[PDB]
Amino acid sequence: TEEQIAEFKEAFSLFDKDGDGTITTKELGTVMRSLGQNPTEAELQDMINEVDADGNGTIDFPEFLTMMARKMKDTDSEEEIREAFRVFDKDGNGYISAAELRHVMTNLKLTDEEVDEMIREADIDGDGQVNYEEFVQMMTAIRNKIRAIGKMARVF
Amino acid sequence: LTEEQIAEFKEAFSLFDKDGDGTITTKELGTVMRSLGQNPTEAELQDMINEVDADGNGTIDFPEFLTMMARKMKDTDSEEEIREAFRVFDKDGNGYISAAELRHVMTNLGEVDEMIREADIDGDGQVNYEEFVQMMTAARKEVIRNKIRAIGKMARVFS
Ligand SMILES: [Ca+2]
Ligand SMILES: [Ca+2]
Ligand SMILES: [Ca+2]
Ligand SMILES: [Ca+2]
Ligand SMILES: [Ca+2]
Ligand SMILES: [Ca+2]
Ligand SMILES: [Ca+2]
Ligand SMILES: [Ca+2]
Known part of the structure; x- marks a missing residue:
């Protein structure tokens, strides 16, 4: 509820570097390294696989949000x-x-x-x-x- | 806020309120703060109370305390x-x-x-x-x- 929503959309778009409405492993890797992390390819699949409920290999908007919630909580x-x-x-x-x-x-x-x-x-x-x-x-x-x-x- | 949030807020207030009269004094905010390794002067304790001291009684009641926590968390x-x-x-x-x-x-x-x-x-x-x-x-600067x-x-x- 609110403009939490503009925050969510800002967060998603920072990951979705090409603007197509999905975040790939690549995309994820690229933001993660700008954050001062150096994740392996396996680390990246797994953050995708935990939220990839439709099985397509990428993250869309409700998946990303669930990824945020889980990650924020922990x-x-x-x-x-x-x-x-x-x-x-x-x-x-x-x-x-x-x-x-x-x-x-x-x-x-x-x-x-x-x-x-x-x-x-x-x-x-x-x-x-x-x-x-x-x-x-x-x-x-x-x-x-x-x-x-x-x-x-x-x-x- | 779900009952888990309130209970936690309640815990917290009862860490401060080491006695239990439902009010939080400068003496008590000081004790607890030093227990987290800080060293606030009395003037910093008093400002902390005055910022959320809505009925001006120089002490912090439970809703004032909520208010102090919400501002310090967002800050x-x-x-x-x-x-x-x-x-x-x-x-x-x-x-x-x-x-x-x-x-x-x-x-x-990008x-x-x-x-x-x-x-x-x-x-x-x-x-x-x-x-x-x-x-x-x-908008643009702002974007x-x-x-x-x-x-x-x-x-x-x-991280
Ligand atoms: Ca994309
Ligand atoms: Ca520099
Ligand atoms: Ca998916
Ligand atoms: Ca007390
Ligand atoms: Ca041991
Ligand atoms: Ca030790
Ligand atoms: Ca008061
Ligand atoms: Ca300068």
Whole structure:
């Protein structure tokens, strides 16, 4: 609803370099490299195949929109997870320690024994602390506080 | 907004409102902000409240808070789109878009002479970040802004 629609049409036309109303793998490749990516040919087929519901090998306007929705939803979620990670990981060393987890939980009350336990639940590789991979994987199937930390920190 | 959005907004307000009196004070906005590693002065805390303090009671009620979040989100989304679009253009990383950067990129995408000149307020011959910001916030000129916006947006979605 609205002129979201002019935005969508602008977005599509930036990909549809020839104006014919479809985006090919080529077209996609060319915009992607201007964005500072270097996608392989296989990467490009697959972004086409996920949204190619009519099977024709290219992306039209409702397919592109679905591609946008899926990609918007997963950038946003993954950006907020990564902001919440950065919030806990205050020394920037790539791992959430128990003292870091505690400090953050507090400032927003867990005993040391409690926070060791939160870690153990998420600590797939056994090293006593929570890396990015593990944080990601905890955030998946409260949490909800963490999720709002990540959104908020973003927006701030 | 679906119930998931509201619940999240509600979470968020209850991160700030560390007690629960339904109001958000300067003391409380400060605590939470420092928990995300920022260091705002009292004067920045007070401005944040005053910008959305519709009934002038120097504190933030739940709808004021929504209002603060909606503006900061749109302002963050905006700033990040513009920055990314800067980054797509400033290919050599040096903090200025030259005419040739700008031409290379447009020709590449199939969307210069002198879009540069109109943007280059300090007269140094190319487009610094502030000037890119100014031009993107200040039909034909406008079609160009709109094309560039879609570039910042797309950028953001694919990084
Ligand atoms: Ca095309
Ligand atoms: Ca198709
Ligand atoms: Ca750490
Ligand atoms: Ca671990
Ligand atoms: Ca309160
Ligand atoms: Ca108020
Ligand atoms: Ca440059
Ligand atoms: Ca200049």
